Paper text:
C-terminal truncations that remove more of α8 cannot be expressed. The loss of the cavity in BimBH3mini:BaxΔC28 complex through movement of α2 demonstrates that the positions of α2 and α8 are coupled, but sheds little additional light on the unfolding pathway of unlatching.
The intrinsic pathway to apoptosis is regulated by interactions between members of three factions of the Bcl-2 protein family: the BH3-only proteins such as Bim and Bid, which initiate the process, the essential effectors Bax and Bak, and the prosurvival members, which oppose the action of both other factions. Unlike Bak, which is constitutively anchored in the mitochondrial outer membrane (MOM) via its C-terminal segment, Bax is largely cytosolic in healthy cells and accumulates at the MOM only upon a death signal. Core/latch dimers of Bax and Bak form on treatment of the monomeric proteins with certain BH3 peptides and CHAPS, and Bax and Bak core domains form symmetric homodimers, supporting that unlatching the core domain is a necessary step to Bax and Bak oligomerisation and permeabilisation of the MOM. Bim and Bid are both potent direct activators of Bax, but Bim is less dependent on interactions via its ‘h0' residues than is Bid.
Numbering used by the authors:
A (entry chain B), B (entry chain B): 144 to 159
C (entry chain A), D (entry chain A): 10 to 37, 48 to 164
Amino acid sequence: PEIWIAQELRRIGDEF
Amino acid sequence: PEIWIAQELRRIGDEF
Amino acid sequence: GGGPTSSEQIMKTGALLLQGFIQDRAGRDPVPQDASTKKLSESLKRIGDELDSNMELQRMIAAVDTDSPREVFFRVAADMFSDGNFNWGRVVALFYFASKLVLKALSTKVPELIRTIMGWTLDFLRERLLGWIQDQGGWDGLLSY
Amino acid sequence: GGGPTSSEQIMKTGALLLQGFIQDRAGRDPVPQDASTKKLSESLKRIGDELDSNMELQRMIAAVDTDSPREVFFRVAADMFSDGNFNWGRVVALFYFASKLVLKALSTKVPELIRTIMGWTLDFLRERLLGWIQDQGGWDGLLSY
């Protein structure tokens, strides 16, 4: 769940 | 100043 | 066994009334209350609400150096009843002060939290991100991106 | 001496940007910024604002057991850059998470504060007010008053 957040921030970061 | 507060709460309490 | 005059009910009801009261003043979870306790609560909110309008009091609560909110509480509590008198008005005003102390304490505790969390973030930045940030020519790189 | 690529500016500007950013997300004091830093800040608020609208993310940030907000931060920070890549998007998202962590931490720290302040109030009540409260027949005395 900490990890969900990590993957989502990465995804979002990369997408920007 | 702590004391101001104390006297005011007493005053208010007693007045009620 | 154990009615209203018992120390147990006094502490129990006292805890529910105070907790309810503090949460109530923090509006500007809830707490489980039977019927009579709820009635006591209205008989507290009225007083809390009036005191909220005492602008002078608010300024002096704001001005208190709260390096030690516990010392502040007991000094105030001690000075309030030092003449040896009691009434319900004083007890309630004391409860009022406690709820205000909570709000005040955050106002001192919360910058601390930011600094701490910042500490972690910047620790990580120095050790993990900084090399890459330098390769961009520092934060000026972000203006472009 | 000491321009944008220097570790000193990176940490200094980094600290101002993060502090400004966190305070900015806590709206829902300020921070001193020269012109360019202010420009960087707008280039962060936009991203922060978009992320605020990611409802799924918000739910998962809310669901995190934050018994150890520091462990949480470093686990998230570590997992984010574990593939060895960097870009500004990730750095900003990390800053976003930190500001959210502050808000979350209070949400755990603040009940604690109430319990503590309550502890003082009820300690005082037991030892200083209770005799008088019993003489009134307990809190039922207050309904009448």
